Amino acid sequence: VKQDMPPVGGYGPIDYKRNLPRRGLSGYSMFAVGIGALLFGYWSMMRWNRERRRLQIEDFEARIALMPLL
Amino acid sequence: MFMINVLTLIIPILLAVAFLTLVERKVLGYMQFRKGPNVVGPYGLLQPIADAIKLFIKEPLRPATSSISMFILAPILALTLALTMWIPLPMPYPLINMNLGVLFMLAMSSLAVYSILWSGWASNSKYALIGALRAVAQTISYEVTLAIILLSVLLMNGSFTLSTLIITQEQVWLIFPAWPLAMMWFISTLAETNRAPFDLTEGESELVSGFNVEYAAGPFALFFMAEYANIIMMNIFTTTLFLGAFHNPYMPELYTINFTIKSLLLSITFLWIRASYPRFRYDQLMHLLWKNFLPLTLALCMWHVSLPILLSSIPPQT
Protein backbone atom coordinates (compact mmCIF):
# COMPACT_ATOMS: atom_id res chain seq x y z
CA VAL A 1 0.00 0.00 0.00
CA LYS A 2 0.96 3.66 -0.42
CA GLN A 3 0.00 6.39 2.04
CA ASP A 4 1.30 9.62 3.55
CA MET A 5 3.85 8.37 6.09
CA PRO A 6 6.96 9.88 7.70
CA PRO A 7 10.22 8.33 6.46
CA VAL A 8 12.01 5.35 7.98
CA GLY A 9 14.41 7.48 10.02
CA GLY A 10 11.74 10.04 10.90
CA TYR A 11 11.93 13.79 10.58
CA GLY A 12 14.81 15.89 11.85
CA PRO A 13 15.01 18.01 14.97
CA ILE A 14 13.09 21.30 14.81
CA ASP A 15 14.13 24.33 16.84
CA TYR A 16 11.37 25.63 19.10
CA LYS A 17 13.13 27.70 21.80
CA ARG A 18 13.90 31.40 21.79
CA ASN A 19 17.28 32.50 20.38
CA LEU A 20 18.22 36.09 20.97
CA PRO A 21 21.76 36.91 19.79
CA ARG A 22 22.85 39.50 22.42
CA ARG A 23 25.03 41.97 20.55
CA GLY A 24 26.68 45.41 20.46
CA LEU A 25 29.40 47.01 22.56
CA SER A 26 29.44 47.43 26.31
CA GLY A 27 27.97 50.70 27.55
CA TYR A 28 31.39 51.96 28.64
CA SER A 29 32.50 51.71 25.00
CA MET A 30 29.73 53.89 23.56
CA PHE A 31 30.11 56.33 26.47
CA ALA A 32 33.84 56.63 25.73
CA VAL A 33 33.16 57.02 21.99
CA GLY A 34 30.63 59.79 22.64
CA ILE A 35 32.93 61.57 25.09
CA GLY A 36 35.85 61.39 22.64
CA ALA A 37 33.69 62.73 19.81
CA LEU A 38 32.56 65.54 22.12
CA LEU A 39 36.17 66.44 22.96
CA PHE A 40 37.26 66.34 19.30
CA GLY A 41 34.36 68.57 18.26
CA TYR A 42 35.09 70.97 21.12
CA TRP A 43 38.76 71.25 20.10
CA SER A 44 37.98 71.81 16.41
CA MET A 45 35.27 74.38 17.19
CA MET A 46 37.69 76.14 19.56
CA ARG A 47 40.39 76.45 16.89
CA TRP A 48 38.01 77.59 14.15
CA ASN A 49 36.24 80.11 16.40
CA ARG A 50 39.58 81.65 17.39
CA GLU A 51 40.53 81.92 13.70
CA ARG A 52 37.13 83.47 12.94
CA ARG A 53 37.65 86.04 15.70
CA ARG A 54 41.04 86.93 14.18
CA LEU A 55 39.47 87.37 10.73
CA GLN A 56 36.66 89.51 12.17
CA ILE A 57 39.23 91.72 13.93
CA GLU A 58 41.11 92.11 10.63
CA ASP A 59 37.91 93.09 8.78
CA PHE A 60 36.94 95.56 11.53
CA GLU A 61 40.34 97.25 11.44
CA ALA A 62 40.06 97.52 7.65
CA ARG A 63 36.68 99.21 8.17
CA ILE A 64 38.21 101.58 10.74
CA ALA A 65 40.98 102.49 8.29
CA LEU A 66 38.40 103.09 5.55
CA MET A 67 36.05 105.27 7.67
CA PRO A 68 37.41 108.88 7.29
CA LEU A 69 37.02 109.14 3.50
CA LEU A 70 33.43 107.88 3.72
CA MET B 1 13.55 88.45 -12.07
CA PHE B 2 12.53 87.37 -8.57
CA MET B 3 9.32 85.82 -9.96
CA ILE B 4 11.27 83.15 -11.87
CA ASN B 5 13.33 82.35 -8.77
CA VAL B 6 10.18 82.10 -6.63
CA LEU B 7 8.46 79.81 -9.17
CA THR B 8 11.53 77.58 -9.49
CA LEU B 9 11.61 77.38 -5.69
CA ILE B 10 7.93 76.55 -5.17
CA ILE B 11 7.03 74.18 -8.04
CA PRO B 12 9.83 71.53 -7.85
CA ILE B 13 9.26 71.11 -4.11
CA LEU B 14 5.66 70.17 -4.98
CA LEU B 15 7.08 67.71 -7.51
CA ALA B 16 9.41 66.48 -4.76
CA VAL B 17 6.36 66.00 -2.53
CA ALA B 18 4.66 63.90 -5.22
CA PHE B 19 7.71 61.70 -5.79
CA LEU B 20 8.11 61.51 -2.01
CA THR B 21 4.64 59.92 -1.95
CA LEU B 22 5.86 57.53 -4.66
CA VAL B 23 9.03 56.46 -2.85
CA GLU B 24 7.10 56.49 0.45
CA ARG B 25 4.71 53.80 -0.73
CA LYS B 26 7.53 51.90 -2.46
CA VAL B 27 9.96 51.78 0.49
CA LEU B 28 7.17 51.33 3.07
CA GLY B 29 6.12 48.27 1.10
CA TYR B 30 9.73 47.14 0.79
CA MET B 31 10.44 46.78 4.49
CA GLN B 32 7.07 45.01 4.75
CA PHE B 33 8.39 42.24 2.44
CA ARG B 34 6.19 43.37 -0.48
CA LYS B 35 6.61 45.33 -3.67
CA GLY B 36 5.46 48.91 -4.05
CA PRO B 37 3.35 50.56 -6.76
CA ASN B 38 4.82 49.51 -10.11
CA VAL B 39 1.79 48.75 -12.33
CA VAL B 40 0.75 52.22 -13.52
CA GLY B 41 4.12 53.25 -14.94
CA PRO B 42 7.62 51.85 -15.36
CA TYR B 43 8.51 51.15 -11.71
CA GLY B 44 5.38 53.14 -10.83
CA LEU B 45 6.57 56.51 -12.11
CA LEU B 46 3.00 57.58 -13.01
CA GLN B 47 1.47 56.93 -9.57
CA PRO B 48 1.81 60.55 -8.28
CA ILE B 49 0.24 61.96 -11.46
CA ALA B 50 -2.76 59.63 -11.11
CA ASP B 51 -3.03 60.47 -7.40
CA ALA B 52 -2.91 64.21 -8.11
CA ILE B 53 -5.45 64.18 -10.94
CA LYS B 54 -7.74 61.77 -9.06
CA LEU B 55 -8.06 64.03 -6.00
CA PHE B 56 -8.83 67.08 -8.17
CA ILE B 57 -11.71 65.58 -10.18
CA LYS B 58 -13.62 64.29 -7.16
CA GLU B 59 -16.43 66.13 -5.37
CA PRO B 60 -15.35 68.66 -2.68
CA LEU B 61 -18.36 67.72 -0.46
CA ARG B 62 -18.57 70.62 1.96
CA PRO B 63 -20.45 69.67 5.16
CA ALA B 64 -23.59 71.51 6.17
CA THR B 65 -22.63 71.81 9.85
CA SER B 66 -19.12 73.09 9.08
CA SER B 67 -18.38 76.80 9.37
CA ILE B 68 -17.30 77.47 5.79
CA SER B 69 -14.85 80.31 6.57
CA MET B 70 -12.18 78.42 8.51
CA PHE B 71 -13.12 75.24 6.61
CA ILE B 72 -11.97 76.89 3.38
CA LEU B 73 -9.20 78.89 5.10
CA ALA B 74 -7.30 76.08 6.87
CA PRO B 75 -5.76 74.11 3.93
CA ILE B 76 -4.59 77.17 1.97
CA LEU B 77 -2.95 78.56 5.10
CA ALA B 78 -1.33 75.16 5.75
CA LEU B 79 0.10 74.97 2.23
CA THR B 80 1.30 78.59 2.34
CA LEU B 81 2.97 78.12 5.74
CA ALA B 82 4.67 74.94 4.58
CA LEU B 83 5.78 76.91 1.50
CA THR B 84 6.73 80.26 3.04
CA MET B 85 9.55 79.08 5.33
CA TRP B 86 11.65 77.57 2.52
CA ILE B 87 13.16 80.98 1.74
CA PRO B 88 15.84 81.42 4.47
CA LEU B 89 17.36 78.01 3.68
CA PRO B 90 20.84 78.45 2.14
CA MET B 91 20.89 76.46 -1.06
CA PRO B 92 23.94 77.46 -1.10
CA TYR B 93 22.59 80.99 -1.57
CA PRO B 94 19.16 81.53 0.02
CA LEU B 95 16.26 83.29 -1.66
CA ILE B 96 15.98 85.97 1.05
CA ASN B 97 19.05 86.78 3.14
CA MET B 98 17.50 87.42 6.54
CA ASN B 99 19.78 88.05 9.51
CA LEU B 100 17.26 86.39 11.84
CA GLY B 101 16.08 83.48 9.70
CA VAL B 102 16.01 81.12 12.69
CA LEU B 103 13.43 83.37 14.39
CA PHE B 104 11.43 83.46 11.15
CA MET B 105 11.49 79.65 11.01
CA LEU B 106 10.39 79.42 14.65
CA ALA B 107 7.51 81.88 14.25
CA MET B 108 6.22 80.39 10.98
CA SER B 109 6.50 76.94 12.59
CA SER B 110 4.39 78.20 15.49
CA LEU B 111 1.88 79.46 12.91
CA ALA B 112 1.66 76.05 11.20
CA VAL B 113 -0.48 74.56 13.98
CA TYR B 114 -3.27 77.11 13.42
CA SER B 115 -4.43 75.40 10.23
CA ILE B 116 -4.82 72.17 12.22
CA LEU B 117 -6.76 73.97 14.97
CA TRP B 118 -9.04 75.77 12.50
CA SER B 119 -9.70 72.57 10.54
CA GLY B 120 -10.49 70.77 13.79
CA TRP B 121 -12.90 73.43 15.01
CA ALA B 122 -14.47 74.41 11.66
CA SER B 123 -15.83 70.92 11.00
CA ASN B 124 -18.52 70.02 13.54
CA SER B 125 -17.49 66.58 14.78
CA LYS B 126 -16.10 64.90 17.88
CA TYR B 127 -13.15 63.29 16.06
CA ALA B 128 -11.95 66.66 14.74
CA LEU B 129 -12.22 68.10 18.26
CA ILE B 130 -10.15 65.24 19.70
CA GLY B 131 -7.59 65.68 16.91
CA ALA B 132 -7.37 69.41 17.64
CA LEU B 133 -6.88 68.71 21.36
CA ARG B 134 -4.13 66.18 20.60
CA ALA B 135 -2.47 68.68 18.25
CA VAL B 136 -2.58 71.28 21.04
CA ALA B 137 -0.92 68.79 23.41
CA GLN B 138 1.68 67.96 20.74
CA THR B 139 2.51 71.67 20.40
CA ILE B 140 2.78 71.96 24.21
CA SER B 141 5.21 69.03 24.15
CA TYR B 142 7.46 70.02 21.28
CA GLU B 143 7.77 73.84 21.37
CA VAL B 144 9.48 74.30 24.76
CA THR B 145 12.07 71.69 23.84
CA LEU B 146 12.64 72.67 20.19
CA ALA B 147 13.34 76.33 20.99
CA ILE B 148 16.07 75.39 23.49
CA ILE B 149 17.57 72.78 21.11
CA LEU B 150 17.86 75.39 18.37
CA LEU B 151 19.29 78.02 20.73
CA SER B 152 21.89 75.69 22.25
CA VAL B 153 22.99 74.34 18.86
CA LEU B 154 23.09 77.91 17.51
CA LEU B 155 25.23 79.17 20.42
CA MET B 156 28.44 78.22 18.60
CA ASN B 157 27.22 79.77 15.33
CA GLY B 158 27.39 83.32 16.71
CA SER B 159 24.28 84.73 15.03
CA PHE B 160 20.78 83.79 13.90
CA THR B 161 21.68 83.93 10.19
CA LEU B 162 21.41 80.71 8.21
CA SER B 163 23.99 81.99 5.71
CA THR B 164 26.73 82.03 8.37
CA LEU B 165 25.72 78.48 9.36
CA ILE B 166 27.50 77.21 6.24
CA ILE B 167 30.71 78.95 7.39
CA THR B 168 30.91 77.01 10.67
CA GLN B 169 31.02 73.66 8.82
CA GLU B 170 34.33 74.56 7.11
CA GLN B 171 36.40 72.67 9.71
CA VAL B 172 34.12 70.06 11.33
CA TRP B 173 30.42 69.29 11.61
CA LEU B 174 28.51 70.55 14.63
CA ILE B 175 27.07 67.06 15.11
CA PHE B 176 30.39 66.14 16.76
CA PRO B 177 30.27 68.70 19.63
CA ALA B 178 26.45 68.45 19.85
CA TRP B 179 25.50 64.83 19.21
CA PRO B 180 23.09 64.68 22.23
CA LEU B 181 21.42 67.84 20.94
CA ALA B 182 21.34 66.14 17.53
CA MET B 183 19.31 63.32 19.09
CA MET B 184 17.01 65.85 20.81
CA TRP B 185 16.56 67.75 17.54
CA PHE B 186 15.76 64.60 15.57
CA ILE B 187 13.10 63.55 18.09
CA SER B 188 11.71 67.10 18.04
CA THR B 189 11.49 67.07 14.23
CA LEU B 190 9.78 63.69 14.56
CA ALA B 191 7.26 65.28 16.93
CA GLU B 192 6.59 68.57 15.11
CA THR B 193 5.79 67.33 11.59
CA ASN B 194 3.19 64.81 12.93
CA ARG B 195 4.90 61.67 11.65
CA ALA B 196 4.81 58.28 13.36
CA PRO B 197 5.47 57.38 16.17
CA PHE B 198 4.51 60.99 16.99
CA ASP B 199 1.60 61.31 14.53
CA LEU B 200 -1.27 61.56 17.08
CA THR B 201 -3.49 63.60 14.71
CA GLU B 202 -3.98 61.58 11.52
CA GLY B 203 -4.48 58.40 13.50
CA GLU B 204 -5.88 55.31 11.81
CA SER B 205 -6.54 53.10 14.84
CA GLU B 206 -7.25 55.76 17.48
CA LEU B 207 -9.35 58.11 15.34
CA VAL B 208 -10.43 57.72 11.72
CA SER B 209 -8.51 60.66 10.29
CA GLY B 210 -8.59 63.20 13.13
CA PHE B 211 -8.37 66.87 12.18
CA ASN B 212 -9.36 66.28 8.53
CA VAL B 213 -11.77 63.37 9.01
CA GLU B 214 -14.56 65.48 7.46
CA TYR B 215 -12.27 66.76 4.68
CA ALA B 216 -13.06 65.18 1.32
CA ALA B 217 -10.84 65.31 -1.76
CA GLY B 218 -9.44 68.57 -3.10
CA PRO B 219 -9.05 70.32 0.26
CA PHE B 220 -7.57 67.09 1.67
CA ALA B 221 -4.62 67.00 -0.75
CA LEU B 222 -3.42 70.41 0.48
CA PHE B 223 -2.78 69.01 3.97
CA PHE B 224 -0.95 66.06 2.39
CA MET B 225 1.39 68.26 0.35
CA ALA B 226 1.82 70.65 3.29
CA GLU B 227 2.93 67.84 5.60
CA TYR B 228 5.28 66.35 3.01
CA ALA B 229 6.83 69.72 2.16
CA ASN B 230 7.17 70.17 5.93
CA ILE B 231 9.07 66.91 6.39
CA ILE B 232 11.32 67.46 3.34
CA MET B 233 12.12 71.02 4.41
CA MET B 234 12.65 69.97 8.04
CA ASN B 235 15.14 67.31 6.94
CA ILE B 236 16.90 69.89 4.75
CA PHE B 237 17.06 72.20 7.78
CA THR B 238 18.49 69.40 9.95
CA THR B 239 21.07 68.63 7.24
CA THR B 240 22.11 72.30 7.13
CA LEU B 241 22.21 72.52 10.94
CA PHE B 242 24.24 69.40 11.73
CA LEU B 243 25.76 67.92 8.56
CA GLY B 244 26.67 71.02 6.57
CA ALA B 245 28.87 70.38 3.58
CA PHE B 246 31.84 72.00 1.84
CA HIS B 247 30.95 75.26 0.08
CA ASN B 248 33.01 76.71 -2.77
CA PRO B 249 31.95 80.13 -4.14
CA TYR B 250 33.20 79.30 -7.65
CA MET B 251 31.18 76.05 -7.98
CA PRO B 252 27.82 75.74 -6.18
CA GLU B 253 27.33 72.35 -7.88
CA LEU B 254 29.38 70.60 -5.18
CA TYR B 255 27.31 71.93 -2.29
CA THR B 256 24.00 71.37 -4.09
CA ILE B 257 24.98 67.75 -4.80
CA ASN B 258 26.18 67.19 -1.24
CA PHE B 259 23.24 68.66 0.66
CA THR B 260 20.75 67.08 -1.77
CA ILE B 261 22.27 63.64 -1.16
CA LYS B 262 22.46 64.18 2.62
CA SER B 263 18.88 65.46 2.91
CA LEU B 264 17.63 62.61 0.70
CA LEU B 265 19.40 60.09 2.95
CA LEU B 266 17.91 61.75 6.03
CA SER B 267 14.42 61.56 4.49
CA ILE B 268 15.02 57.87 3.76
CA THR B 269 16.02 57.48 7.43
CA PHE B 270 12.77 59.26 8.37
CA LEU B 271 10.80 56.79 6.23
CA TRP B 272 12.74 53.96 7.91
CA ILE B 273 11.84 55.33 11.35
CA ARG B 274 8.15 56.04 10.70
CA ALA B 275 7.13 52.37 10.24
CA SER B 276 9.14 50.39 12.77
CA TYR B 277 7.73 51.65 16.09
CA PRO B 278 4.33 51.64 17.80
CA ARG B 279 2.48 54.93 18.11
CA PHE B 280 2.96 56.81 21.37
CA ARG B 281 0.08 57.87 23.55
CA TYR B 282 -0.27 61.63 23.80
CA ASP B 283 -0.29 61.47 27.60
CA GLN B 284 3.19 59.92 27.39
CA LEU B 285 4.22 62.68 24.96
CA MET B 286 4.41 65.27 27.74
CA HIS B 287 5.32 62.54 30.20
CA LEU B 288 8.52 62.34 28.13
CA LEU B 289 9.24 65.78 26.65
CA TRP B 290 8.23 67.66 29.82
CA LYS B 291 9.87 65.03 32.05
CA ASN B 292 12.94 63.50 30.37
CA PHE B 293 13.79 65.91 27.54
CA LEU B 294 13.44 69.21 29.41
CA PRO B 295 15.95 68.75 32.31
CA LEU B 296 18.53 67.25 29.95
CA THR B 297 18.23 70.10 27.49
CA LEU B 298 18.34 72.65 30.33
CA ALA B 299 21.62 71.11 31.50
CA LEU B 300 23.00 71.07 27.96
CA CYS B 301 21.81 74.65 27.40
CA MET B 302 23.67 75.93 30.45
CA TRP B 303 26.66 73.80 29.42
CA HIS B 304 26.71 75.41 25.98
CA VAL B 305 26.32 78.82 27.62
CA SER B 306 29.34 78.21 29.85
CA LEU B 307 31.46 76.31 27.30
CA PRO B 308 32.82 79.09 25.00
CA ILE B 309 33.75 81.03 28.15
CA LEU B 310 35.55 77.89 29.38
CA LEU B 311 37.62 77.21 26.26
CA SER B 312 37.91 80.87 25.09
CA SER B 313 35.93 80.10 21.93
CA ILE B 314 33.42 82.95 21.65
CA PRO B 315 32.14 82.93 18.05
CA PRO B 316 31.92 86.16 16.05
CA GLN B 317 28.47 87.66 15.58
CA THR B 318 29.37 88.73 12.02
Curated annotation (Swiss-Prot), chain B:
One of its GO terms (biological process) is mitochondrial respiratory chain complex I assembly. The keyword Transmembrane applies. Keywords: Electron transport, Membrane, Mitochondrion, Mitochondrion inner membrane, NAD, Respiratory chain, Translocase, Transmembrane, Transmembrane helix, Transport, Ubiquinone. The chain crosses the membrane at residues 2-22, 68-88, 100-120, 147-167, 172-192, 217-237, 253-273, 294-314. It catalyses: a ubiquinone + NADH + 5 H(+)(in) = a ubiquinol + NAD(+) + 4 H(+)(out). Its EC number is 7.1.1.2. One of its GO terms (cellular component) is mitochondrial inner membrane. It is an enzyme of class 7 (translocase). It comes from the Eukaryota. It is a multi-pass membrane protein. It is found in: Mitochondrion inner membrane. InterPro entries: NADH_UbQ_OxRdtase_su1/FPO, NADH_UbQ_OxRdtase_su1_CS. The keyword Electron transport applies. Signal peptide: none annotated. One of its GO terms (molecular function) is NADH dehydrogenase (ubiquinone) activity. Pfam families: NADHdh (PF00146). Disulfide bonds: none annotated. Belongs to the complex I subunit 1 family. Core subunit of the mitochondrial membrane respiratory chain NADH dehydrogenase (Complex I) that is believed to belong to the minimal assembly required for catalysis. Complex I functions in the transfer of electrons from NADH to the respiratory chain. The immediate electron acceptor for the enzyme is believed to be ubiquinone. This is NADH-ubiquinone oxidoreductase chain 1. It comes from Ovis aries.
